[PDB]
Amino acid sequence: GLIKDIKRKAPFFASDFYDALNIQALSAILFIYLATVTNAITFGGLLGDATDNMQGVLESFLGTAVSGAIFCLFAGQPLTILSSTGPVLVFERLLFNFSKDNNFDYLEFRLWIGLWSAFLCLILVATDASFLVQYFTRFTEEGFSSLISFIFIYDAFKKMIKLADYYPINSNFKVGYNTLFSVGNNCNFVPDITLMSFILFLGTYTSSMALKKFKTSPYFPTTARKLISDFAIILSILIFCVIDALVGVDTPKLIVPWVCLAAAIPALLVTILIFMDQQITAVIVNRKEHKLKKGAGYHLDLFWVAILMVICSLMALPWYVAATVISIAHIDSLKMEFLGVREQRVTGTLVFILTGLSVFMAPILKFIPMPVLYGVFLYMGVASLNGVQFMDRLKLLLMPLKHQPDFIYLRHVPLRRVHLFTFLQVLCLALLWILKSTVAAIIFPVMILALVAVRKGMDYLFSQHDLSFLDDVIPEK
Amino acid sequence: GLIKDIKRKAPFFASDFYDALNIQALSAILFIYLATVTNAITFGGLLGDATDNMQGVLESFLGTAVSGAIFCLFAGQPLTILSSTGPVLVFERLLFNFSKDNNFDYLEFRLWIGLWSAFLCLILVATDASFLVQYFTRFTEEGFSSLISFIFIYDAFKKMIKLADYYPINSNFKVGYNTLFSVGNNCNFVPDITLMSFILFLGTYTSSMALKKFKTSPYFPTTARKLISDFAIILSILIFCVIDALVGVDTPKLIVPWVCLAAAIPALLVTILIFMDQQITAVIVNRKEHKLKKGAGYHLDLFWVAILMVICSLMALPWYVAATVISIAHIDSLKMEFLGVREQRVTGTLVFILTGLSVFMAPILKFIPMPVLYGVFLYMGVASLNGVQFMDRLKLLLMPLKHQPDFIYLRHVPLRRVHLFTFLQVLCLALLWILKSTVAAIIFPVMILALVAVRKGMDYLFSQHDLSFLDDVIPEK
Helix, strand or coil: HHHHHHHHHHHHHHHHHHHCCCCCHHHHHHHHHHHHHHHHHHHHCCCHHCCCCCCCHHHHHHHHHHHHHHCCCCCCCCCCEECCCCCHHHHHHHHHHHCCCCCCHHHHHHHHHHHHHHHHHHHHHCCCCHHHHHHHHCCCCCHHHHHHHHHHHHHHHHHHHHHHHHHHCCCCCCCCCCCCCCCCCCCCCCCCHHHHHHHHHHHHHHHHHHHHHHHHHCCCCCCHHHHHCCCCCHHHCCCCCCCCCCCCCCCCEEECHHHHHCCCCHHHHHHHHHHHHHHHHHHHHHHHCCCCCCCCCCCHHHHHHHHHHHHHHHHHCCCEECCCHHHHHHHCCCCCCCCCCCCCCCCCHHEEEECCCCCCCCCHHHCEEHHHHHHHHHHHHHCCCCHCCCCHCCCCCCCCCCCCCCCHHHHHHHHHHHHHHHHHHHHHHHHHHHCCCCHCCCCHHHHHHHHHHHHHHHHHHCCCCCCCCCCCCCCCC | HHHHHHHHHHHHHHHHHCCCCCCCCHHHHHHHHHHHHHHHHHHHCCCCCCCCCCCCCCCCHHHHHHHCCCCCCCCCCCCCECCCHHHHHHHHHHHHHCCCCCCCCHHHHHHHHHHHHHHHHHHHHCCCCHHHHHHHHCCCHHHHHHHHHHHHHHHHHHHHHHHHHHHCCCCCCCCCCCCCCCCCCCCCCCCHHHHHHHHHHHHHHHHHHHHHHHHHHHCCCCHHHHHHHHHHEEEHHHHHHHHHCCCCCCCCCCCCHHHHHHHHHHHHHHHHHHHHHHHHHHHHHCCCCCCCCCCCCCCCCHHHHHHHHHHHHHHCEEEEEECCCHHHHHHHHCCCCCCCCCCCCCCHHHHHHHCCCCCCCCCHHHCCCCHHHHHHHHHHHHHCCCCHHHHHCCCCCCCCCCCCCCCCCCCCCHHHHHHHHHHHHHHHHHHHHHHCCCCCHHHHHHHHHCCCCCHHHHCCCCCCCCCCCCCCCCCCC
């Protein structure tokens, strides 16, 4: 079982905490704190349909406070961050309407939804959770990484067109006094927030992507160039924090404070997706490209999420599976120069402690504008697909032929097969995009099992292949 | 005289017009048309203090219509563009106040100001106009090129802080009906133009500088990449033209339609600066870096500006000396790949014909926003100091030492002298900056003769020098 997994993760606990005093370890904490407290508040409104008051503190903060805290001590590379996700949210919209017809119970119904689903998860940690060596082999693991990035980028722009529809421009001026507002007439709609917002938003993407490319620019000293190429995101929030302060217009800103066996069959459903989400939020984090790691825990974290599932279910707290875009944005920061990454254990868990400090003099977090935080979402989206192999060939359709690729000797004669392979890979994303639009994400791995099905169709046209995992840069000499 | 100069410029007239059918020759016309009709309208307001009605057409358009037209047929590399400039404008503020105490004559006084100044210019074309080989030798000709660029960039930002002070933000909202405007109360000041304006302005600089750097990016076909890297500026105006159209807020936009001998001594003054402006707006355009040119006319253009001086003086039209930033932005466009530039004669003179077409269905030029045209000023400012030598060393103070310079063997042992030389060159710009602030630009070459004076002070610390002209890239092998 997980005893063979906990045996190799055990002799590293003292080696990690004394590896966490570096300066850039401070960078990733207050960055991802700003990401997580944004990702907490942006789902607290969406989940705020069902669970309305229930406490003198909003439960989505205290939920993600303890759930990552007990996780990211050590959980089999705890570089991953637990938070809430897409499919669990849309399921609870369904389950609230499935319990809107008064099946005697709603929240206590969710208990026996949550309790037996952990029990099914405790059977799955006992039997086997290992699908790596024949299912997720370098196709449809970028093919999901490069699709959940495209949703998270598209979720960024959607959260501002909703902002633009909440702050509508009058678009009729230069005359003067004809747009008085007053239960009034003709002018009950705001000016000049949304035009300010796209300055901050497009700025802090163009700022943050500039200071990361600043690392190669020679026009500053090197040992300070590394210090600015790692504090890049946080002061890009600070620069546009005070530009919001100088320009006296406001904006949205952060503001922080028979029953049982019928509950078996939806617990049969949620233990599928929470299981299936955990692997693909792990196999992209494992990622042999991220060189010189110090362990790979697949069972105990899946055992860890079952432990926190019953304490979240008992206290009416939302179920929390590992992240996919924030974790690959986490471990972007924690790396030297390639020469390995890290194994920092406190940076993964200080971010939940500072999340646990709910107020932390909340006026110090009140004058951060909300649209600058959508920009650092769009930076984490675009930078999440940096090192994937699939983008290096989707930008090869547009690349004319008399140019240089990377790998040698095995696809230089089938040049046309490259253009055929990625077009097949682009083709399956369009299926998964439009099935995400309908109600088919609650059955979540059906866009993964059908996604890995065409990997078996690839076996009918076979040759030598460097289209396989554990092999990213090969010098051959 | 100029007979030896007109003798070599004569055997090229038929060679130029048949050299003007290329596609990128169309690019530079409608770009610089948009620059010149902006530079006409932006001085027509400033000169609009004195000459108020005087015609059913604004005289600043028809002024720059004919004055570049008869010039840029052929005038000794007519790549330069005539327009109005700084020092002539501030002189006419002085002369209007010098004639505000009713010295019997204002406009007809300017006749005998203009007429004898041309007569003094006709003596100076007869005697000698050749100061090259001992005064403007690669120091203080970048030293003026890299200073008039810094004024033109600083003039761009100043024209929007004036725009921001004309459209002031209320900066007090989210409540609602407390800011009614009504001879009213508390709300007689506009919203949401100036926040729109900095989107267009910073955008069309970041857009235009991106599409010029697009030329090296492989992710598009090459023979279309050259077509987009030369239409870069004009459609960057078009892209942000329609973004202004979609976003329904307006902005400022383009909207086009005893006496004699006392007049000797100011005509003694203006024939200094108009003479002195012409050389430094020519020696930066001559520029042996711009390889493989086909002539160098120094006398006949100075004879040409005297011809148009009397027709401008007779019709009450402003005096028009050659440009310094637009001309180096002109000949940026007209170049192949380095491999020479051009000798196009119609592109320099079609731009005044289209300027001469004043209306040209002026509603087709009415919905171009004025703040996108300040952006293409700031692009022409920053790109004017591209190839200067002085910026390549002012960005060497910030460059730490274990790095690569360009030239070999003569300043690699005096590394410290490089840091001393440019600091001396930075020092004289600060003198010229603060003397430009006071009333010392009307005596304009006193910041040039004192500028070339420290070139003689350089002779006391002499060695071998590659700090000299006609020598820019040297392979030495």
